[PDB]
Design a protein around this ligand. Structure first.
Ligand SMILES: [Zn+2]
Ligand SMILES: [Zn+2]
Ligand SMILES: [Zn+2]
Lengths: 111, 129, 64, 49, 147, 49, 85, 42, 49
C-alpha cells in the first residue's frame, strides 16, 4: 500500500534522520517531509500465500454454471450453496475447494 | 443483463448481438461485431418465480403453428427466434451457460440394458440450473 | 565510459552532414557534441534515458 | 482432456468437475454407441493422432 | 507492452510500451504523463484497484522511479516525438505537436481519434496494464489464442 | 461384470478426488499434487479398462 | 532431460539410511530453498531493536550505519534437509 | 403443455432450413456488402 | 537503501548451502541386478541407487 504525499502527489522515499536517529519518508518533487511510523523499508517474501482467498465476488450465488452442494453453510445453514477451487494459477495450487455459501460467501473447508 | 437479454429475446435488439457476463472478473461485455460465429439453442425457463422454471419455453402450440405456417391470431423460423423460444449464442457466450444435451435431461429420471448407452453419472451437482 | 559516435546528424554552422559526433559521457551526466569541420562543441547534461537524438534536439533549441 | 472452457471441458458440464466422464472417459463400447460428449472427445483424440 | 527483464534481473521489472510510428519502446509512465496524468498518484489510482495487493504496487514501482525525469506534459511529449520516426529538424516546437497528433491518432483509434478524450485512453491503458500484470502475477491463466 | 467393474473404478476415482481435495492424498516423488493426482487417475482408469 | 545414474558402494547400496545421507549431501540446496521471507528493517539502534518479533531473541543473544537486513527461514524445509540454522 | 418429442425437434429444424437454407450466410454477406458497404467505402 | 536490497537479492541467489552445483534434485531409486552366487549360480539382488 505504498502511498504518496497529500499535496505533492509524488512517491515517498524512506530517508533516515541521522541527526535525530529516526526514519522518515521523503519526496523529491517537494519539500513536504513527514516522519515514518514504521522502520520497515522493504518486505520481499518468497512463500507467496497472499490473496488466495481474494477470489471472492458478491454475485457468486447468481451464476448457474456453478454446481449446488448439499453441505451445511456455517453462517446461513442453507442446503443451496455453490463451491469452487483456488483461482490462483500456481503450479503448486492446492485442491482445497473454498466452498462458498450464498448469504455469507465465506471461504471454509471441511478438513 | 436480465433486461438486456429480455430485450434481445423480444427482438428489439438484433438477435445476433452477444450479451456476455463474466461474474468472476466483475466484467460485462457486449458484442455486435461482424464475422463472429453463432448457433441456435432452445431457451429453458430459469426464473425461480413461476412454475415454468426448468421447462422449455417452447410448447406444442409453437410446433402446431410452425406446421401450419400462420399464427391463429406468416409464422416461420424468424417468428420462433423473435417470439422468445430460441436464441443464437456465439462462441464466447457459451462460456457462461448450462446446456442440457436433450430435453429428457431437464427432467430428473428414477432399465439396465446391455445394447444401449448409459448417460454420464452427473452426480457431482446435487442440483442443476 | 568514453563513447565515439560518427552519427549522421546535420550541423548548423558548417552545414555538413555526418560532421556531428554525439559522444556519450554518462559518468557525471555530461553530454558533448563534437563536430569535424567547424569543430564546435555543445554541452548538455544527459539523464539516464538521454540519447544522441536528445542532445541533437537540445542543441537545435540552443542554436535558436 | 483439458479445460478449453472456463474450468470445464464442455458447457454441458458444471464448473469445477473432475469426474472421469467430465474429462473424456468413454464408457460405452462401440457396439453400444457413444453419447455426444464422448463422441466429441473421441474425435479430439483421433484428430490429434 | 513488453514486461521486460527477468526475476531479480535488471533491477526491477521494467515495463515499456511500443507505440505506433515510434523508433523505440517507451517507459509506461512516460506515455502516461504525456497523455495528461503527470502526477503519479493518479497513475497508481488508474492502474491499481486493490490497495492491499501491495505486491503489484511494489513491482510496478521500478517503472515509477525511472519516470521521475519527466514532470510535465510538454517534456514528456517532446521525449515521445523525439523518437517519432520522423526526419531530423522538426525540433521541439513542432515535436510536441507531432506527439500530440500521434497520441490523438494512431493510438487505440477504435476508441477515438480526436482531442479531449485522452481520459478514456488513460483509463483503458490502466485497465490493460492491470490485466497484463495480473497475468504476470499468475492470478489468471494466460489468454488462450485458440479460444 | 463389466458394469460392476466400471462403477467400482469410478467410485475409486471419486474417493481419490475426495482425499486429494482434502490434501489427504500422498505426493509422488518429483510430482506435485495435480500431477500425481492425474497420474493416479490415469492408472486407475487404464486398469479398469 | 539431463540425468545421472549414480551407483553407490557395495555396503551403502544395500543400506537405505546411508543412502538418504548421501542424497542429502549431494542435493544442491541453496538458502532460497530454505529461506521463507525477507524484510529490510531500518533498525536505528545498532545495540538493540525496535522489532518485537525478535526483541526477546536479540536481547538474550546480546549477553556503524544503523541499516539492518532481516530475513525469515522456513523451519519445515531446513529440518527436511536436516541442517540447523 | 405436453413434453416435446424428437419429431418436434426435427420439425423445428425443418422450418429453420426452410427459412434460411444451407448457404444463407454467403448471400447475406454479399447482399450486405452490395447494399451498404460500397457507399461507405466511397 | 538500494545497496541493501541488491545485497539481499545476491544472498537469495549466489549462496550455496550444500550439494554439488548443477544438481536440481536427486531421486532414491532401487535397482535390480543379476549377480553370481556362492555356488556360481545367478541370483537377482535388489540394490539402492
Ligand atoms: Zn511530494
Ligand atoms: Zn452459506
Ligand atoms: Zn559543424
Amino acid at each position: 500500500s505504498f502511498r504518496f504525499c497529500l499535496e505533492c502527489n509524488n512517491m515517498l522515499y524512506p530517508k533516515e534522520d541521522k541527526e535525530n536517529q529516526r526514519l522518515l519518508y521523503s519526496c523529491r518533487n517537494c519539500d513536504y517531509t513527514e516522519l515514518a511510523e514504521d522502520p520497515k523499508v522493504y518486505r520481499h517474501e518468497l512463500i507467496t500465500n497472499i490473496g488466495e482467498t481474494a477470489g471472492i465476488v458478491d454475485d457468486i450465488g447468481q451464476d448457474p454454471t456453478l454446481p449446488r452442494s448439499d453441505k451445511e453453510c456455517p453462517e446461513c445453514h442453507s442446503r443451496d450453496c455453490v463451491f469452487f477451487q483456488s483461482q490462483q494459477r500456481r503450479k503448486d495450487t492446492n485442491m482445497t475447494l473454498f466452498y462458498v455459501c450464498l448469504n455469507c460467501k465465506k471461504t471454509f473447508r471441511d478438513e | 443483463v436480465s433486461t438486456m437479454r429480455d430485450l434481445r429475446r423480444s427482438g428489439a435488439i438484433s438477435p445476433e448481438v452477444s450479451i456476455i457476463r463474466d461474474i468472476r472478473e466483475r466484467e460485462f461485455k457486449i458484442f455486435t461485431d461482424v464475422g463472429r460465429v453463432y448457433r441456435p439453442l432452445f431457451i429453458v425457463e430459469d426464473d425461480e418465480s413461476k412454475d415454468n422454471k426448468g421447462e422449455l419455453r417452447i410448447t406444442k402450440e409453437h410446433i402446431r403453428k410452425i406446421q401450419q405456417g400462420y399464427d391463429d391470431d406468416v409464422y416461420g423460423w424468424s417468428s420462433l427466434v423473435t417470439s422468445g423460444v430460441i436464441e443464437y449464442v456465439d462462441g464466447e457466450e457459451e462460456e457462461t451457460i448450462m446446456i442440457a444435451m436433450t430435453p429428457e435431461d431437464l427432467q430428473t429420471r428414477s432399465l439396465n440394458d446391455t445394447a444401449k448407452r448409459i448417460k454420464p453419472e452427473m452426480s457431482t451437482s446435487s442440483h442443476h440450473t | 565510459i568514453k563513447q565515439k559516435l560518427e552519427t549522421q546528424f546535420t550541423c548548423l554552422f558548417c552545414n555538413h552532414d555526418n560532421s556531428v559526433v554525439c559522444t556519450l559521457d554518462k559518468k557525471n551526466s555530461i553530454g558533448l557534441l563534437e563536430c569535424k569541420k567547424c569543430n564546435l562543441s555543445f554541452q548538455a547534461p544527459i539523464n539516464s534515458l538521454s540519447q544522441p537524438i536528445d542532445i541533437y534536439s537540445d542543441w537545435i533549441d540552443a542554436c535558436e | 482432456i483439458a479445460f478449453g472452457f472456463a474450468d470445464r471441458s464442455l458447457p454441458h458440464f458444471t464448473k469445477d468437475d473432475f469426474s472421469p466422464e467430465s474429462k473424456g472417459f468413454v464408457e460405452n463400447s462401440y457396439l453400444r454407441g457413444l453419447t455426444p460428449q464422448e463422441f466429441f472427445f473421441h474425435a479430439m483424440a483421433g484428430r490429434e493422432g | 507492452i513488453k514486461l521486460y527483464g527477468r526475476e531479480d534481473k535488471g533491477t526491477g521489472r521494467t515495463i515499456k510500451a511500443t507505440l505506433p510510428y515510434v523508433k523505440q519502446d517507451i517507459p509506461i509512465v512516460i506515455v502516461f504523463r504525456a497523455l495528461g496524468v503527470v502526477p503519479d498518484g493518479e497513475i497508481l489510482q488508474h492502474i491499481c484497484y486493490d490497495e492491499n495487493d501491495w505486491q503489484m504496487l511494489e513491482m510496478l514501482k521500478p517503472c515509477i522511479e525511472e519516470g521521475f525525469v519527466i514532470q510535465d506534459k510538454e517534456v514528456a511529449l517532446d521525449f515521445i516525438g523525439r523518437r517519432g520516426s520522423a526526419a531530423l529538424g522538426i525540433r521541439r516546437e513542432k515535436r510536441i505537436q507531432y506527439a500530440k497528433d500521434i497520441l490523438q491518432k494512431e493510438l487505440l483509434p477504435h476508441i477515438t481519434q480526436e482531442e479531449g478524450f485522452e481520459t478514456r485512453k488513460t483509463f483503458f491503458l490502466g485497465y490493460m496494464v492491470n490485466r497484463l500484470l495480473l497475468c504476470a502475477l499468475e492470478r489468471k491463466d494466460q489468454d488462450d489464442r485458440d479460444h | 461384470e463389466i458394469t460392476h467393474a466400471i462403477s467400482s473404478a469410478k467410485e475409486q476415482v471419486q474417493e481419490i478426488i475426495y482425499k486429494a481435495q482434502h490434501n489427504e492424498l500422498e505426493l509422488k516423488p518429483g510430482m506435485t499434487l495435480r500431477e500425481s493426482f492425474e497420474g493416479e487417475v490415469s492408472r486407475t482408469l487404464n486398469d479398469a479398462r | 532431460t539431463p540425468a545421472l545414474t549414480v551407483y553407490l558402494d557395495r555396503e551403502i547400496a544395500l543400506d537405505i539410511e546411508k543412502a538418504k545421507v548421501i542424497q542429502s549431501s549431494i542435493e544442491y540446496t541453496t538458502l532460497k530453498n530454505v529461506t521463507s521471507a525477507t524484510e529490510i528493517y531500518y533498525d536505528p539502534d545498532p545495540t538493540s531493536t525496535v522489532i518485537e518479533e525478535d526483541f526477546d531473541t536479540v536481547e538474550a543473544y546480546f549477553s556503524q550505519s544503523p541499516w539492518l537486513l532481516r530475513l525469515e527461514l522456513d523451519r519445515a524445509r531446513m529440518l527436511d534437509k536436516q541442517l540447523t540454522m | 403443455d405436453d413434453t416435446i418429442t424428437t419429431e418436434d425437434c426435427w420439425t423445428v429444424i425443418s422450418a429453420f432450413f426452410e427459412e434460411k437454407g444451407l448457404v444463407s450466410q454467403q448471400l447475406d454477406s454479399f447482399d450486405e456488402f452490395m447494399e451498404t458497404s460500397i457507399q461507405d467505402l466511397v | 537503501d538500494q545497496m541493501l536490497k541488491r545485497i539481499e537479492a545476491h544472498m537469495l541467489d549466489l549462496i550455496a548451502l550444500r550439494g554439488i552445483p548443477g544438481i536440481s534434485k536427486v531421486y532414491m531409486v532401487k535397482h535390480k541386478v543379476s549377480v553370481p552366487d556362492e555356488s556360481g549360480e545367478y541370483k537377482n539382488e535388489e540394490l539402492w541407487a
